[PDB]
Design a protein around this ligand. Structure first.
Ligand SMILES: [Mg+2]
Ligand SMILES: [Mg+2]
Ligand SMILES: [Mg+2]
Ligand SMILES: [Mg+2]
Ligand SMILES: [Mg+2]
Ligand SMILES: [Mg+2]
Ligand SMILES: [Mg+2]
Ligand SMILES: [Mg+2]
Ligand SMILES: [Mg+2]
Ligand SMILES: [Mg+2]
Ligand SMILES: [Mg+2]
Ligand SMILES: [Mg+2]
Ligand SMILES: [Mg+2]
Ligand SMILES: [Mg+2]
Ligand SMILES: [Mg+2]
Ligand SMILES: [Mg+2]
Ligand SMILES: [Mg+2]
Ligand SMILES: [Mg+2]
Ligand SMILES: [Mg+2]
Ligand SMILES: [Mg+2]
Ligand SMILES: [Mg+2]
Ligand SMILES: [Mg+2]
Ligand SMILES: [Mg+2]
Ligand SMILES: [Mg+2]
Ligand SMILES: [Mg+2]
Lengths: 193, 148, 99, 52, 203
RNA sequence: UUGACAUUGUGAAGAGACAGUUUC
RNA sequence: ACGGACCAAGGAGUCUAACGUCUAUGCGAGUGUUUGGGUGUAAAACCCAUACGCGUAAUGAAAGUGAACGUAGGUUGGGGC
RNA sequence: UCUUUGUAAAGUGCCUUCGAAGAGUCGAGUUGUUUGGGAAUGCAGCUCUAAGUGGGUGGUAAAUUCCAUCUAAAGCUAAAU
RNA sequence: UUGACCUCAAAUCAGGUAGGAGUACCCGCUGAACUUAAGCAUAUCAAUAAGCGGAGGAAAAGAAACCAACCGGGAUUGCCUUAGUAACGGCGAGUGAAGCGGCAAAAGCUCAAAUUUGAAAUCUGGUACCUUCGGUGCCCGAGUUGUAAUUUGGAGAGGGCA
């Protein structure tokens, strides 16, 4: 029934919803279990740092392309430029992504330098021999954090030529909107001698 | 808590506040939005005009991220400079050394012109700008550079 | 080609330094090979034509390519496949008629 | 089971109440009223050496 | 090799050669039992590319299944409900006939595991299929690391659970926006989308 | 129950219209 | 007119999702630690990054555009000073 | 503590030709069902049935130009659930 | 006449395997109506209950014929969001995802299509012995209507050079 001045509600509770109620009573228990699992895995793989090194990539879409973030793995071109094979990089703790491609030089150099830093800061134990002392560092991400590149200086000179950025945007929008009809018009005008 | 509810006060009183005649029942007028066009019409038309019918055209598979464009007014433009360089820039308004404000980095898509910035030159980098916002920035002595 | 450097327009977007990644071996999934061209030619001259291919060739000879394309669009599922099939019938007719 | 059991409190209000409780520990009348036998304590707050 | 010629010639199903072979073979299959063992694959290249190998422990069965719709098995066509559920005749089974074929062969040969199947023939009444099966008990399969995965008990009756190629297609197991209802299992997706999730500190 | 397509192939006649096609 | 032979015990506006008005509290152009991580005397308490929600802009079906003539205006009341 | 092994195995740079990649399947029509998927989201039945600089997808049906992106019709795989 | 081959049989032949139970969770099939719409048929309940088949300690999914349209991301799963939104709906009642972003966990790969052709290099079984979750010798058999090595698109292969 409808009465009084109230917003129209859309509470979706017309199915057997009480059969599928999940209450996360186990939030604390699962946090403890995750911490125990991490401690167990760290002990099992010691002294490896519990996570692979990840590349820096640009987030897609207009909403997020202003930010960089960790990607899945380094490209084959990036690994080759760093001077090692993908098969060996995967064995020395480098995530490798065969399906990502490089079209951005700044990203490519950033990831190559990231691999150079990793290889400079890494110690690889010989396959057969006496291992030297090495304390376990747990986080490659904390050791090699992702940094947002600097886009501009803090302050500089005003260089104005009176081009009216608003007019620039208007004219770009108009040029795109009328690009097709102008091409057609030029096509028939060219055809008519 | 239950001890503060009118249910405790209604103990001993027959109808529990629901009335002897009206006599609280299950769904006397229907369930949910039943009767919006028939017997709840007056409430619908008085409190929710425009509820029934279609307006406009559909957009199949609309992605809200395409329309991401948060707005920043000129009167808040100077809050994108951290306060500890803010006063240093406010005094000595210099054309040769004017602060650069990257509004996209701050998380904005378009600069709007609610107006009255101080008469100090600034380089405002934005994806979009309103005509009045650009005129006020240029009047203050700055410039808008377009970025993507 | 290059991004203009503004948020709208024909080539909108940020101007970055391009790199032209090396070509994947995929993107050549549909490429023909000498092995496959030989196999397909031999199988075609072994098996011959389907009844609807015979009908298409007859229609090309009598009624023309427009009606042949219409019938091939009915038999296959799409206009683009009809055009490709009619072109292949035309090559068959030309090879059977030449010399 | 899906009755609400835990209650969210704003972090700042939690810190407000903690600060007030800490300051109340330094009021002799408040501790005595709360029920502690501090009638012969030298001074409140009571600070002892780090050797403890 | 010759498998490439076999692959290309099999695609010429309305050529005179294949029309003749299909008519003779369909009569031969119709004479035999509905399910019967095949001495060798009829299409060896197709069996190869579906995973068949000519070694002990690989078995081929041939099965025919009745074509057409699934008539709703209600007495006298009476459905006791609303008009939207009153249909009897134009209803379609949600699994393919090749899935029905695989399941009947697996029931016949419960000691084996259905690996794959392929179409071989059809007439108006029956579609004919050949099913590749692997014997999990044969030591030639228990060794040979490339194939002893199917000895794992989790692969019991995968044709019954829709884990073959036709089973995954009928289940709609594919990537992309066209399969939003069915990527991780449609009943699992429905449970996830219809679960009320409440936290300790209510959001 | 009636029509269409599929199952569905092979000879002729010959209504023909007209290298052949096409219904009959 | 209907229920009630008698007594004991049990016996009926609850919880949840979303929300309106009002009130209290914190902080305020911001606000929300508790998805998660850290930590722990271990489902508690304590601590925290990036995001995200709502808010700080509207309007149009939409493409779009987008808030100071002026002591942020004038007139009439207006508590207090 | 034994051991064995390089003419085993694997890896990398430059020049040349090449580079096989799944068919009653994809796809199309129609019927039923299903989906938020709307000139049709998936599935299935019947009919038709491809190609190889090809094919699929790019959420308004169609023709004509491009462009982007992946590589189906075969298969295995722990954890977080 | 004798010996093969193919196909099909028989045996209380040698050795195995399937069935049934449980079924909270999982993978499919089949499949309602009560109910709501203040009536009712599409719709809703609900792609649910009941019915049927099939697993495991998890299952399923899974290394893109993906998402996108960006300066691009990059197997699968799950949480927080997206969002009660785009959209569907006697456009009524109702219903209703997905991309991006933060996070938990992270892991990658295998066949078919290629002449070993100067050498079927492959495999079951039986038997004898032994260091017995197996190994070796011998033998029969399987297999060229193709068992090994080699390659899986990110590649990779023949040749040359190093
Ligand atoms: Mg009273
Ligand atoms: Mg009473
Ligand atoms: Mg009463
Ligand atoms: Mg009433
Ligand atoms: Mg009325
Ligand atoms: Mg109905
Ligand atoms: Mg009465
Ligand atoms: Mg009485
Ligand atoms: Mg009584
Ligand atoms: Mg009582
Ligand atoms: Mg392929
Ligand atoms: Mg059904
Ligand atoms: Mg699997
Ligand atoms: Mg026996
Ligand atoms: Mg009703
Ligand atoms: Mg009623
Ligand atoms: Mg009624
Ligand atoms: Mg059930
Ligand atoms: Mg078990
Ligand atoms: Mg699994
Ligand atoms: Mg692949
Ligand atoms: Mg993903
Ligand atoms: Mg919202
Ligand atoms: Mg629904
Ligand atoms: Mg090799």
């Amino acid at each position: 029934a409808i009465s009084k001045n109230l917003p129209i509600l859309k509470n979706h509770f017309r199915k057997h919803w009480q059969e599928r109620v999940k209450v996360h009573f186990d939030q604390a228990g699962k946090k403890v279990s995750r911490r125990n699992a991490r401690a167990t895995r760290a002990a099992k793989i010691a002294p490896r740092p519990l996570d692979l090194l990840r590349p820096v990539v640009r987030a897609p879409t207009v909403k997020y392309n202003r930010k960089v973030r960790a990607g899945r793995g380094f490209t084959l071109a990036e690994v080759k430029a760093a001077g090692l094979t993908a098969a060996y990089a995967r064995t020395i703790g480098i995530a490798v992504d065969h399906r990502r491609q490089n079209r951005n030089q700044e990203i490519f150099d950033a990831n190559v330098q990231r691999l150079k830093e990793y290889q400079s800061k890494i110690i690889v134990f010989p396959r057969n021999g006496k291992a030297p002392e090495a304390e376990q560092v747990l986080s490659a991400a904390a050791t090699f954090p992702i940094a947002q590149p600097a886009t501009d200086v803090e302050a500089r000179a005003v260089q104005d030529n009176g081009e009216s950025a608003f007019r620039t945007l208007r004219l770009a929008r108009s040029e795109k909107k009328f690009r097709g009809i102008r091409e057609k018009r030029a096509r028939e005008k060219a055809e008519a001698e | 808590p239950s001890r503060f509810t009118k249910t405790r006060k209604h103990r001993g009183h027959v109808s529990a506040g629901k009335g002897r005649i009206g006599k609280h029942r299950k769904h006397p007028g229907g369930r949910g939005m039943a009767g919006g066009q028939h017997h709840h019409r007056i409430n619908m038309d008085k409190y929710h005009p425009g509820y029934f019918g279609k307006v406009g055209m559909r957009y199949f598979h609309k992605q809200q991220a395409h329309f991401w464009k948060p707005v920043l007014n000129l009167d808040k433009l100077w809050t994108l400079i951290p306060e500890d360089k803010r006063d240093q820039y406010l005094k000595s308004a210099s054309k040769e050394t004017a602060p650069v404000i990257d509004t996209l980095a701050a998380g904005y898509g378009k600069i709007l012109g609610k107006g009255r910035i101080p008469n100090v030159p600034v380089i405002v980098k934005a994806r979009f700008v309103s005509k009045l916002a650009e005129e006020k920035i240029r009047a203050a002595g700055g410039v808008v550079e377009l970025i993507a | 080609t290059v991004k203009t450097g503004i948020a709208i327009g024909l080539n909108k977007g940020k101007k970055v330094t391009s790199m032209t990644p090396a070509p994947k071996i995929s993107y050549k999934k549909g490429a023909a090979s000498n092995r496959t061209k030989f196999v397909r030619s031999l199988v075609r001259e072994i098996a011959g034509l389907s009844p609807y291919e015979r009908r298409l060739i007859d229609l090309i000879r009598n009624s023309g390519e427009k009606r042949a394309r219409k019938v091939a669009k009915k038999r296959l599922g799409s206009f683009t496949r009809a055009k490709a099939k009619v072109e292949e019938m035309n090559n068959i007719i030309a090879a059977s008629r030449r010399h | 089971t899906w009755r609400k059991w835990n209650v969210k409190v704003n972090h700042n209000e939690k810190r407000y109440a903690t600060a007030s409780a800490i300051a109340a520990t330094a009021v002799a009348s408040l501790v005595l009223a709360r029920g502690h036998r501090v009638e012969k304590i030298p001074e409140i707050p009571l600070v002892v050496s780090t050797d403890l | 090799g010759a498998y490439k010629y076999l692959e290309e010639l099999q695609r010429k199903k309305q050529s005179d050669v294949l029309r003749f072979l299909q008519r003779v073979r369909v009569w031969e299959y119709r004479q035999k039992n509905v399910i019967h063992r095949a001495a060798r694959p009829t299409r060896p290249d197709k069996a190869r590319r579906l995973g068949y190998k000519a070694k002990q422990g690989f078995v081929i069965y041939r099965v025919r299944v009745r074509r057409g719709n699934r008539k709703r098995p209600v007495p006298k066509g009476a459905t006791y409900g609303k008009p939207t559920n009153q249909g009897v005749n134009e209803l379609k089974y949600q699994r393919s006939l090749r899935a029905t074929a695989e399941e009947r062969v697996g029931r016949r040969a419960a000691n084996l595991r259905v690996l794959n199947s392929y179409w071989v023939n059809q007439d108006s009444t029956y579609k004919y299929f050949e099913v590749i099966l692997v014997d999990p008990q044969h030591k030639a399969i228990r060794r040979d690391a490339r194939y002893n995965w199917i000895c794992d008990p989790v692969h019991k009756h995968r044709e019954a659970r829709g884990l073959t190629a036709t089973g995954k297609k009928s289940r709609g197991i594919n990537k992309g926006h066209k399969f939003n209802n069915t990527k991780a299992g449609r009943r699992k997706t429905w449970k996830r989308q219809n679960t009320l999730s409440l936290w300790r500190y209510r959001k």
